Each structure stands twice: as C-alpha cells, then as structure tokens.
Amino acid sequence: ENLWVTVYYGVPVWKDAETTLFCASDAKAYKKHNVWATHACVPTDPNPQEIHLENVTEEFNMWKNNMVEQMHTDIISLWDQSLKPCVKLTPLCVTLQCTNVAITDGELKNCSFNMTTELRDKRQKVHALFYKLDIVPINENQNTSYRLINCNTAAITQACPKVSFEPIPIHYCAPAGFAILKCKDKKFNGTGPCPSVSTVQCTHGIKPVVSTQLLLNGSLAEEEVMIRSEDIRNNAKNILVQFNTPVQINCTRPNNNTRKSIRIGPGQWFYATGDIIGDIRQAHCNVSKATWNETLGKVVKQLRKHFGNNTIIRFANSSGGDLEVTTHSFNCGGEFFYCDTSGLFNSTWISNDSITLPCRIKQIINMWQRIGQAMYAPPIQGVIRCVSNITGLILTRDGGSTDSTTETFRPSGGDMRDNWRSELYKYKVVKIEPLGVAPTRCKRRVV
Amino acid sequence: IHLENVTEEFNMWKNNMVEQMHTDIISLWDQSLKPCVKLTPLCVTLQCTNV
Amino acid sequence: VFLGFLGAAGSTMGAASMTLTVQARNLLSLLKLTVWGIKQLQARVLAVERYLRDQQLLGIWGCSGKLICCTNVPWNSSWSNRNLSEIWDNMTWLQWDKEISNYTQIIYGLLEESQNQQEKNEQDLLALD
Amino acid sequence: VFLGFLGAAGSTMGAASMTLTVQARNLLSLLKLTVWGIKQLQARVLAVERYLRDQQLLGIWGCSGKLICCTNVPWNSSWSNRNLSEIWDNMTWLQWDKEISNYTQIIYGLLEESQNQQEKNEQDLLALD
Amino acid sequence: VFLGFLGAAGSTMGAASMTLTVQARNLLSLLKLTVWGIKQLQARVLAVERYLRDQQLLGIWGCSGKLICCTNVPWNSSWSNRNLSEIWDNMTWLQWDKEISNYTQIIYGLLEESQNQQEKNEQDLLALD
Numbered sequence: 001e002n003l004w005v006t007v008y009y010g011v012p013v014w015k016d017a018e019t020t021l022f023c024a025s026d027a028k029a030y031k032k033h034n035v036w037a038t039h040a041c042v043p044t045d046p047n048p049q050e051i052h053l054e055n056v057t058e059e060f061n062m063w064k065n066n067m068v069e070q071m072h073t074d075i076i077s078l079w080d081q082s083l084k085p086c087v088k089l090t091p092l093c094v095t096l097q098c099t100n101v102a103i104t105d106g107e108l109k110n111c112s113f114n115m116t117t118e119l120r121d122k123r124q125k126v127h128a129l130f131y132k133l134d135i136v137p138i139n140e141n142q143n144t145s146y147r148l149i150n151c152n153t154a155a156i157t158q159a160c161p162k163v164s165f166e167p168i169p170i171h172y173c174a175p176a177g178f179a180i181l182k183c184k185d186k187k188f189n190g191t192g193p194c195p196s197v198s199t200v201q202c203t204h205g206i207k208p209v210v211s212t213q214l215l216l217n218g219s220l221a222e223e224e225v226m227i228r229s230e231d232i233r234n235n236a237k238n239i240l241v242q243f244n245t246p247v248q249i250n251c252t253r254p255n256n257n258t259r260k261s262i263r264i265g266p267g268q269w270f271y272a273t274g275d276i277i278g279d280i281r282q283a284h285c286n287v288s289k290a291t292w293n294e295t296l297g298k299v300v301k302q303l304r305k306h307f308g309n310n311t312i313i314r315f316a317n318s319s320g321g322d323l324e325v326t327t328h329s330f331n332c333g334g335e336f337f338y339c340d341t342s343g344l345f346n347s348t349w350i351s352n353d354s355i356t357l358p359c360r361i362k363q364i365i366n367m368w369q370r371i372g373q374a375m376y377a378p379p380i381q382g383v384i385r386c387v388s389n390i391t392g393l394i395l396t397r398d399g400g401s402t403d404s405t406t407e408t409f410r411p412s413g414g415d416m417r418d419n420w421r422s423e424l425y426k427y428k429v430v431k432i433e434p435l436g437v438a439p440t441r442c443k444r445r446v447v
Numbered sequence: 448i449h450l451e452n453v454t455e456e457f458n459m460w461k462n463n464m465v466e467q468m469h470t471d472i473i474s475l476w477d478q479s480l481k482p483c484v485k486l487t488p489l490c491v492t493l494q495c496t497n498v
Numbered sequence: 499v500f501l502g503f504l505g506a507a508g509s510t511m512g513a514a515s516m517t518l519t520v521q522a523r524n525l526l527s528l529l530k531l532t533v534w535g536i537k538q539l540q541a542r543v544l545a546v547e548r549y550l551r552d553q554q555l556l557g558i559w560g561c562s563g564k565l566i567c568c569t570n571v572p573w574n575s576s577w578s579n580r581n582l583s584e585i586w587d588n589m590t591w592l593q594w595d596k597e598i599s600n601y602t603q604i605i606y607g608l609l610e611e612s613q614n615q616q617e618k619n620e621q622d623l624l625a626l627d
Numbered sequence: 628v629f630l631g632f633l634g635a636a637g638s639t640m641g642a643a644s645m646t647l648t649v650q651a652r653n654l655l656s657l658l659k660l661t662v663w664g665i666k667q668l669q670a671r672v673l674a675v676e677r678y679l680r681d682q683q684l685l686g687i688w689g690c691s692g693k694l695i696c697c698t699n700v701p702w703n704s705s706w707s708n709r710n711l712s713e714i715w716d717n718m719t720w721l722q723w724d725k726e727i728s729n730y731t732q733i734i735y736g737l738l739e740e741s742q743n744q745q746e747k748n749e750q751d752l753l754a755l756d
Numbered sequence: 757v758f759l760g761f762l763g764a765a766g767s768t769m770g771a772a773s774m775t776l777t778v779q780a781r782n783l784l785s786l787l788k789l790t791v792w793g794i795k796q797l798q799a800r801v802l803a804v805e806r807y808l809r810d811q812q813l814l815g816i817w818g819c820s821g822k823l824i825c826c827t828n829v830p831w832n833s834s835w836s837n838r839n840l841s842e843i844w845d846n847m848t849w850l851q852w853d854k855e856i857s858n859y860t861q862i863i864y865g866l867l868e869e870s871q872n873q874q875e876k877n878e879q880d881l882l883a884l885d
C-alpha cells in the first residue's frame with residue numbers, strides 16, 4: 001500500500017518534434033554529380049526495418065508537417081550549390097539581332113551577336129538559335145534588335161553540362177533519438193487519426209520531381225483514389241489528387257538540335273544551340289484519351305463525395321497567373337517543357353485516339369519564385385523523349401457566388417511545396433523520450 | 448610504444464593514408480588560390496621580342 | 499518475443515516495461531561542406547547530446563547502470579490516484595506520460611535531491627568506521 | 628609494470644586482461660572553415676561516437692562501472708571448444724577475437740537479454756516486499 | 757536550501773560537498789555556415805567532450821554512478837598535512853584544489869591502478885567459486 005516512484009529507461013514514449021533530417025540514397029554507381037544525390041549521401045541500409053506499432057493511433061497533419069518545409073529549403077539550397085562553380089553568362093547580354101529561322105504565315109529565332117573571346121582585346125561574332133520566350137525586343141518601336149529576357153532583372157549562369165537533372169530516389173532519415181511514423185491507412189485522407197501506424201528510420205525512395213499542374217513519377221494511392229486538401233470548403237486552398245492507376249504521358253522534342261561550343265573566355269565555355277537538323281516540329285506530349293477519360297471519371301466520383309452525391313462538375317483551363325503556373329512545366333532530359341493543358345481539363349460531368357498537348361521550351365528559367373538568379377539550360381544534343389507517370393494532380397475551385405448548382409475545377413501550381421506533400425503525407429517526425437517515472441511497491445534498500 | 452610479440456601485415460600500395468594526403472594537398476592548394484588575384488585580363492594579345 | 503523498436507508503444511505499461519532494452523539499443527546508434535554534410539554532422543551531435551542528457555539524469559539519480567531502478571521518493575497521490583492494476587494493466591506509457599507530464603519536473607527534482615544527495619553523505623558517515 | 632597503450636597486444640589474454648585501464652584511458656582523450664578544421668571537428672565527433680557506443684553496450688549489459696564483469700550467460704561450446712588454460716595462457720586477444728568474431732553478434736544479443744532484461748524485473752519483484 | 761550554480765564556492769569544503777548535485781546538473785545541459793553556427797556547433801562539441809572526460813575518470817575509478825565515492829588509496833601525508841577539521845571546516849574547495857593541484861596527477865594515477873585494476877581481477881577470482 002506504500003507506493004514509490006521508480007525510474008524506467010527505455011519507455012515507448014514520444015512527442016511531436018521537428019529536427020534536422022539528413023539524406024540517404026541507395027548505392028547507385030556511374031557521368032554523375034547529379035544535384036540531389038550529390039558527391040555523398042549516406043547509402044541506404046541494405047535492408048530497411050519497418051516495425052508496425054500495434055494498438056497505436058497517432059494524429060497526422062500533412063499540411064502542418066515540417067518535413068515539407070525542410071525538403072523545400074533543401075532543393076533550393078541544392079540548386080544554388082550546383083550553379084556556383086558553373087560558367088556565368090554575364091557577357092551574353094550583348095545586343096542581339098535576330099531573324100526568322102524560310103516560311104510564310106516562328107517560336108525559335110536565328111540570332112547573331114558579338115561575344116568576347118579568350119583574349120581580352122579580341123572579339124568574335126557567332127550565330128545561335130534561341131526560343132521566343134527567352135528573348136524580348138529591345139525596341140517595341142520596333143526595329144528588330146533583341147535581348148535576353150533576364151538581362152533586365154537578374155544575372156544568369158549556365159548549368160554545368162555534366163550534372164543531370166533526373167530525380168533519383170532519396171530517403172529522408174532522422175537522427176538517433178528521433179523516429180518517423182508512417183501512416184499505413186489505405187483510405188487515409190489529409191489529416192486525422194491514423195489507426196494503422198508503423199515506425200521507420202528513413203522514408204521510402206522519394207523522387208524530387210519538380211512539376212506543375214500535374215504530378216509525375218509520384219506514388220500511387222492504394223485502394224481508392226485520394227482527394228486531399230487543407231480546407232475543401234475554402235476554394236483558396238489547392239486540392240491534391242492521387243491516382244490509384246497511373247496514366248502514361250509521352251513528351252518529345254522532335255527537333256534534332258545541335259550543341260555549339262563557343263569559348264567566351266579563358267576556360268569559360270558557352271554552349272549555344274546549333275542550327276536544327278531536319279524538319280522543324282514543336283515539342284508535345286501524348287496521353288491516352290481512354291485512360292484519361294476513365295481516370296478523370298474515377299476522380300469525379302470521389303469529388304461528389306464532398307460536393308453532394310449529385311452535382312455539376314466541369315473542368316476548365318488555368319485562367320490565373322502566367323508562365324509557370326499556366327503550363328504543365330517540368331524537366332525532361334535537360335530541356336524544360338511548358339505544355340498547354342487545356343485539352344485535358346475541358347469537360348463537364350453530370351449524373352488509340354491519344355490526346356496531344358502543345359509544349360513550348362525555354363532555356364532561361366527562374367524556378368521556385370527565385371528572384372535574382374536565372375539559369376541557362378544548355379542545349380541537349382539529339383532528339384529528346386521521356387515517358388513519365390502522371391500519378392497526381394493539383395486543382396483549384398473558381399469560387400464565386402454560384403448557388404452550389406455547378407462546381408468548376410481548374411489546375412494550378414501556386415506553390416512548389418504541394419509536390420513534396422504529395423509524398424510526405426504519410427510521414428511524421430517525433431522525438432523519443434525514454435525516461436518514465438511510475439509508482440510501484442518497491443523501495444530502495446537503505447543498506 | 449613498441450608492441451612486443453606483435454606481427455602485422457602491411458601494404459603501402461593499398462594504404463588509404465596516401466589517398467587522403469593526396470586530396471589534402473590538392474584541397475589546400477585551392478584554398479590558397481581563392482583569395483589571390485585572378486589574371487583574367489592578362490590574356491591580352493602579347494607582342495614579344497628577343498631579350 | 500521481439501516486435502521491434504517502439505513495438506509495445508500501444509501495450510500496457512507492464513508489458514512495455516519488459517522490452518526496455520529494445521529502446522535502449524536504437525537510442526544512440528574536396529570540400530565536405532555540402533548541405534548534407536552540415537546536416538549530418540549537426541544531426542550526429544544532436545543525437546549524442548540527447549542521449550547524454552538522459553544518462554546524466556540517471557547518473558544524478560544513482561541509477562546509471564540499470565534500466566529499472568527503485569528510489570526512496572514516495573508517490574504523492576496528487577500526481578495520480580490510480581491503483582497499480584489500473585496503471586500497469588489499463589494504461590500505456592503514452593497516456594501515462596500525458597497524465598504525469600504536468601508534475602514531471604517536480605518529481606525529477608525530488609528524485610535527485612531526496613535520495614542520492616542524501617544517500618551519498620550518509621554513505622560516507624556509515625562506512626566512516 | 629606499464630608498457631604503454633596496446634603494449635600487451637601480443638601477450639596472452641590473461642596477461643593483457645591485467646592492463647585494461649591502459650586502453651581505457653587513451654580511448655577517449657576569421658573563418659574556422661579550413662580543411663583541417665572540418666577534419667578535426669568531424670574527427671572529434673567520431674571519437675565520442677565510438678566511445679559512447681561501447682559504453683552503451685556496457686550499460687545494457689549492466690556492466691557500466693566495471694572493466695571486468697561476470698554475466699549469467701553460459702558458454703556455449705559451439706563458439707569455442709578450448710579449455711581455460713588454452714584460452715588464457717596460449718592465445719592473444721587478437722587471435723581470440725578472430726576465432727569468436729563469428730558469433731559475437733549472437734553473444735551480444737544473449738548478453739543484453741538473458742540477464743539485465745530479466746534481472747531488472749526480478750529485482751523489482753524481489754525488493755517489492 | 758539552494759543558492760544556485762557554484763553557490764557554495766566560497767563555503768567550507770564540508771558545506772560545499774552537500775550540494776554537488778547542483779554542479780552536476782548544469783554541467784552538461786539556406787546555409788548554416790554562419791560565424792555563429794560554426795561557433796555554436798564547436799562549442800557544443802567542446803561541452804560534451806569535457807563532460808565525457810570526467811565521466812571517463814569516474815569510470816576507470818569505479819565511481820561512475822556516485823557523486824561521493826570512497827577508495828582504497830591511503831592519504832599520503834606529503835600531499836597535505838592538514839587534519840580533517842582544518843580541511844573540511846576551514847578551507848574552500850578552491851584553495852584546496854590550489855594546495856593539491858601539484859600532486860593531482862600522481863593521485864589520479866594511484867586512483868585508477870591501486871583499486872579498480874586490482875579490484876576487478878580479485879573480484880573474478882573471488883566469485884570464481
């Protein structure tokens with residue numbers, strides 16, 4: 001009947017905490033120096049240990065998750081670390097005089113301009129092809145002298161040609177004393193109590209696929225397709241969608257471009273586009289209309305579960321923002337594509353003929369809302385073609401005072417973090433507090 | 448401290464101290480050149496005559 | 499019977515108290531200026547810092563070597579009124595830590611003062627002869 | 628008689644077991660971004676990390692304070708069939724560690740489970756009255 | 757009665773010896789390359805390095821768990837000739853450490869050798885039967 005406190009060291013007790021995670025990737029061997037894997041990420045253990053926690057029920061919140069905020073700052077910081085040593089194209093802001101590529105009734109333009117040479121006193125005139133988006137006319141009156149789009153706002157640096165932009169699986173690990181809780185509930189929505197929970201030291205192979213509008217190469221939701229949002233009632237917050245069946249999308253750049261290596265200084269090398277060899281075709285992606293119409297129908301079924309079992313569900317193209325947010329932007333073999341998705345979100349729902357999408361390309365880009373530094377993607381030699389998985393989406397309501405009679409859904413890409421949340425919805429970081437004090441009928445011996 | 452009775456196998460060719468020292472000299476060199484003056488403008492065309 | 503790290507987190511406190519070794523093991527175990535290197539090194543220092551703090555508390559409570567140690571501090575009923583069967587056969591360490599997290603700091607202070615600071619002086623005066 | 632750090636590495640296991648204190652002592656003891664600074668700081672963190680791991684094993688085996696500790700685990704003959712005189716007066720710790728490095732992981736698991744995880748619960752039920 | 761960290765630094769050695777827990781507690785507890793970050797991380801590694809060194813000495817003296825431990829080493833009078841009342845009721849730990857800082861290294865060597873290196877072998881030969 002006399003109770004005394006006793007210290008237990010190693011009690012399964014944890015508390016919500018945010019710590020500094022680190023990198024971990026398999027032992028992939030090779031060209032290399034891919035930005036994300038870096039020179040050294042801790043190689044994944046030959047065998048990971050996933051330990052299911054019986055009887056455990058933990059509250060999750062993918063929208064207040066700090067793993068997202070950390071990953072975001074890691075991608076940004078990794079990008080800058082790879083641009084620092086590469087060649088900066090400060091002298092490439094010389095006035096450009098551009099002409100058309102002949103044809104009657106032009107996305108790319110043939111530009112001639114003078115560029116410095118190895119020797120300070122000598123100069124050289126070189127001709128290189130450019131895309132319309134990367135250039136603006138220096139007159140508007142108009143004459144026809146053009147300049148690079150970035151020279152007015154921020155400097156520019158050329159991405160090194162060796163580093164590759166292909167995402168590889170990356171595992172986010174937590175330090176000793178902390179742990180990661182994975183929600184294995186198939187039907188798990190955005191937030192809430194997860195009945196089935198397990199613990200792991202590192203996450204699964206998460207590929208840092210930077211996309212917009214459409215989610216590519218992600219992980220497929222099990223069982224039914226999932227509709228995740230922070231506030232379905234609030235139109236302002238985006239809507240994450242995860243497919244149970246992946247749709248296939250083929251993007252190609254049929255032009256047989258060429259790489260022109262023009263030295264612009266001692267050691268500095270600039271890689272310009274070389275006249276195209278062969279026909280002049282524009283890049284485009286294909287999607288099977290049967291699968292997409294089927295996949296889009298499965299989405300509207302889960303959509304009605306939150307907007308009434310019967311309601312008008314239409315789809316329109318992006319009507320807000322410009323440039324990145326209006327086009328399904330992404331990377332493919334080193335070239336940055338920008339596709340018009342009006343053909344995919346152009347339906348209305350109530351109660352082998354593959355779709356084609358126009359894609360334009362740029363070589364000067366400012367990703368992640370970066371203000372101050374632009375990057376020049378060196379031209380990729382040969383024909384480019386990449387087959388990717390479209391696993392998720394990012395939608396948004398139009399809002400307004402419509403009496404709930406009809407609901408409209410448009411794509412968007414407001415923030416880059418939503419891409420990370422599409423793969424970090426199931427994980428959570430907690431710290432282990434192994435000191436527990438409890439009363440027992442034991443007493444220390446006075447001896 | 449001499450280790451009596453000890454007999455150890457050596458291999459100066461598979462020694463990792465060499466590989467480490469090599470990368471240390473290289474990295475030390477670059478660390479000393481970074482703050483010094485870079486002669487990018489010294490690539491002007493030179494007109495040279497005999498002494 | 500081993501379930502793994504934190505396997506008994508949903509079990510009763512009595513069942514979890516049997517596998518404290520499991521949590522004890524996995525509780526500690528040209529330019530390297532990469533973003534990963536700075537994160538890793540800072541993560542490693544954070545892990546040993548938390549481990550040494552808990553081992554520090556066990557030290558000042560005279561319980562360094564053991565996972566289960568008994569003390570001299572009596573259980574003040576204001577902390578919890580629950581009987582032994584209700585505590586050890588009806589509650590998990592999680593919901594227990596939540597019920598007593600309020601008085602943990604007070605309990606830790608009594609745990610370092612009441613015994614091991616009194617015990618050591620009395621141990622010298624006892625083995626003094 | 629002191630020979631120095633690792634002096635008895637070629638001596639018999641019995642002779643080496645007498646100077647374990649020697650190995651125990653020397654086992655732990657504008658911009659600073661120099662290549663040496665990064666190496667040093669990373670080296671210092673590596674030293675304390677290895678030391679704390681061995682002290683962690685001694686902790687979960689209930690042998691924290693001692694250099695020589697006895698256990699409850701019986702010596703399974705499949706590990707080594709050698710008698711005491713042959714082990715302690717004919718072998719060095721090096722060639723011993725090579726002969727038993729095969730079953731070390733199994734032995735470490737039995738060492739943390741068999742006694743100190745059983746010993747602590749039985750210690751509470753014994754001092755329970 | 758608590759005065760705080762180092763509160764009894766000017767008190768007699770006997771009075772200061774009562775609050776050793778106070779000193780024991782507070783004894784351990786895009787680019788992060790800022791001058792502060794390098795200083796902080798290097799400061800944190802320095803703190804755990806000093807703590808582990810003192811805990812290392814307590815380990816090799818068989819006094820790991822305790823703040824007050826008795827040994828087998830007799831007090832050689834050449835170190836200090838002062839009686840117990842004069843030492844513990846007339847001197848502070850500061851002026852004591854100054855009077856004995858001269859022979860501290862010799863005393864530490866006798867403290868690790870005389871008992872715990874002899875004690876552990878005799879403990880095995882005693883519990884050998």
Ligand SMILES: *[C@@H]1O[C@H](CO)[C@@H](O[C@@H]2O[C@H](CO)[C@@H](O[C@@H]3O[C@H](CO[C@H]4O[C@H](CO[C@H]5O[C@H](CO)[C@@H](O)[C@H](O)[C@@H]5O)[C@@H](O)[C@H](O)[C@@H]4O)[C@@H](O)[C@H](O[C@H]4O[C@H](CO)[C@@H](O)[C@H](O)[C@@H]4O[C@H]4O[C@H](CO)[C@@H](O)[C@H](O)[C@@H]4O[C@H]4O[C@H](CO)[C@@H](O)[C@H](O)[C@@H]4O)[C@@H]3O)[C@H](O)[C@H]2NC(C)=O)[C@H](O)[C@H]1NC(C)=O
Pocket residue numbers: 031032164165166167209210216217330331332333334381382385386387388389
């Ligand atoms: C979503 O996930 C999808 C699933 O993966 C992604 O789909 C991926 O799309 C990317 C493109 O965005 C593809 O990468 C590129 O594929 C090109 C086509 O691959 C063909 O050739 C393969 C060659 O075969 C070798 O490798 C295979 C691998 O298993 C091996 O079995 C075989 O034995 C052999 O060793 C063949 O296997 C394939 O089946 C195809 O037929 C490929 O050519 C690209 O490689 C280029 O480019 C990358 C990045 O730019 C570089 O890292 C490479 O080193 C290589 O670049 C070198 O070669 C070029 C060839 O023209 C040159 O132009 C370059 O200048 C360069 O040459 C220099 O370097 C060489 C090496 O040092 C030197 O020898 C030279 O002298 C030069 O110095 C690239 O891999 C993926 O293949 C594709 N995935 C799959 C599974 O197919 C999709 O992209 C994802 N979506 C998003 C948004 O991320």
Ligand SMILES: *[C@@H]1O[C@H](CO)[C@@H](O[C@@H]2O[C@H](CO)[C@@H](O[C@@H]3O[C@H](CO)[C@@H](O)[C@H](O[C@H]4O[C@H](CO)[C@@H](O)[C@H](O)[C@@H]4O)[C@@H]3O)[C@H](O)[C@H]2NC(C)=O)[C@H](O)[C@H]1NC(C)=O
Pocket residue numbers: 217246389
């Ligand atoms: C593009 O999308 C398609 C969509 O299916 C995708 O194909 C699938 O990839 C997965 C892996 O991500 C394959 O699943 C694995 O298949 C291998 C080989 O058969 C098995 O050994 C695996 O077994 C286990 O792992 C599963 C989890 O992945 C566990 O659930 C299971 O318990 C086992 O431990 C695993 O099943 C799958 O087979 C294919 N689908 C088809 C039809 O082949 C494709 O990978 C995507 N492309 C890219 C580049 O990502």
Ligand SMILES: *[C@@H]1O[C@H](CO)[C@@H](O[C@@H]2O[C@H](CO)[C@@H](O[C@@H]3O[C@H](CO)[C@@H](O)[C@H](O)[C@@H]3O)[C@H](O)[C@H]2NC(C)=O)[C@H](O)[C@H]1NC(C)=O
Pocket residue numbers: 100101110111112127129275276
């Ligand atoms: C972009 O503009 C440049 C001009 O600055 C074009 O380069 C010129 O292209 C013409 C083809 O109409 C070349 O004519 C050929 O010249 C070679 C010289 O060896 C000769 O052997 C052929 O018989 C023919 O006359 C011309 O040489 C070339 N000039 C230079 C300096 O390269 C370029 O073709 C234009 N590209 C595009 C895609 O518009």
Ligand SMILES: *[C@@H]1O[C@H](CO)[C@@H](O[C@@H]2O[C@H](CO)[C@@H](O[C@@H]3O[C@H](CO)[C@@H](O)[C@H](O)[C@@H]3O)[C@H](O)[C@H]2NC(C)=O)[C@H](O)[C@H]1NC(C)=O
Pocket residue numbers: 497498
């Ligand atoms: C390398 O070439 C330079 C020329 O650019 C040489 O410099 C010139 O050397 C002549 C000697 O032949 C100098 O003549 C002297 O000029 C001074 C001027 O104060 C005058 O007082 C003397 O009476 C004599 O005329 C000339 O000044 C000098 N020019 C300059 C600009 O310094 C140089 O000597 C050559 N060195 C070698 C090693 O070839």
Ligand SMILES: *[C@@H]1O[C@H](CO)[C@@H](O[C@@H]2O[C@H](CO)[C@@H](O)[C@H](O)[C@H]2NC(C)=O)[C@H](O)[C@H]1NC(C)=O
Pocket residue numbers: 189190191192193228229230231232
């Ligand atoms: C995900 O499912 C959980 C159910 O556990 C939802 O949590 C409830 O949400 C409703 C409104 O949607 C609130 O009235 C309840 O108070 C919530 N319960 C708890 C325990 O928080 C959550 O809202 C769902 N999220 C989404 C985006 O649908």
Ligand SMILES: *[C@@H]1O[C@H](CO)[C@@H](O[C@@H]2O[C@H](CO)[C@@H](O)[C@H](O)[C@H]2NC(C)=O)[C@H](O)[C@H]1NC(C)=O
Pocket residue numbers: 256277278382383
């Ligand atoms: C793209 O154009 C290049 C030419 O620059 C083609 O490469 C040539 O291919 C032929 C084969 O028909 C070889 O005989 C030549 O030696 C190649 N030359 C070079 C410079 O590579 C390439 O085949 C074209 N690719 C496509 C898809 O049309």
Ligand SMILES: *[C@@H]1O[C@H](CO)[C@@H](O[C@@H]2O[C@H](CO)[C@@H](O)[C@H](O)[C@H]2NC(C)=O)[C@H](O)[C@H]1NC(C)=O
Pocket residue numbers: 248249250286287288352354387
């Ligand atoms: C995208 O490309 C892939 C392959 O390049 C296409 O998959 C092929 O589909 C046809 C059926 O129409 C099969 O006969 C082939 O065997 C498939 N090839 C491979 C490699 O799987 C896919 O159909 C294309 N999708 C679209 C929308 O065009």
Ligand SMILES: *[C@@H]1O[C@H](CO)[C@@H](O)[C@H](O)[C@H]1NC(C)=O
Pocket residue numbers: 095097112113114123125
């Ligand atoms: C190129 O350089 C020459 C010589 O410096 C100059 O006369 C000419 O105007 C320049 N042309 C262009 C298009 O910059």
Ligand SMILES: *[C@@H]1O[C@H](CO)[C@@H](O)[C@H](O)[C@H]1NC(C)=O
Pocket residue numbers: 317318319326340341342
């Ligand atoms: C959206 O669709 C309209 C047709 O109603 C079209 O004129 C417009 O160019 C499209 N804009 C984008 C950004 O897709």
Ligand SMILES: *[C@@H]1O[C@H](CO)[C@@H](O)[C@H](O)[C@H]1NC(C)=O
Pocket residue numbers: 317342343346
């Ligand atoms: C939408 O589909 C209709 C009907 O086929 C077609 O007339 C229209 O051009 C399409 N619009 C877009 C933006 O794709």
Ligand SMILES: *[C@@H]1O[C@H](CO)[C@@H](O)[C@H](O)[C@H]1NC(C)=O
Pocket residue numbers: 596597598600
């Ligand atoms: C915890 O303590 C706070 C402050 O005394 C009190 O308001 C709260 O009700 C307590 N909750 C517990 C211990 O259940």
Ligand SMILES: *[C@@H]1O[C@H](CO)[C@@H](O)[C@H](O)[C@H]1NC(C)=O
Pocket residue numbers: 725726727729
């Ligand atoms: C060590 O173990 C391996 C695998 O069981 C065995 O092949 C080898 O012969 C053993 N060597 C020893 C312990 O002498």
Ligand SMILES: *[C@@H]1O[C@H](CO)[C@@H](O)[C@H](O)[C@H]1NC(C)=O
Pocket residue numbers: 854855856858
């Ligand atoms: C300390 O030791 C030194 C060297 O033996 C001696 O010169 C000095 O007088 C001593 N001072 C003390 C211990 O008071």
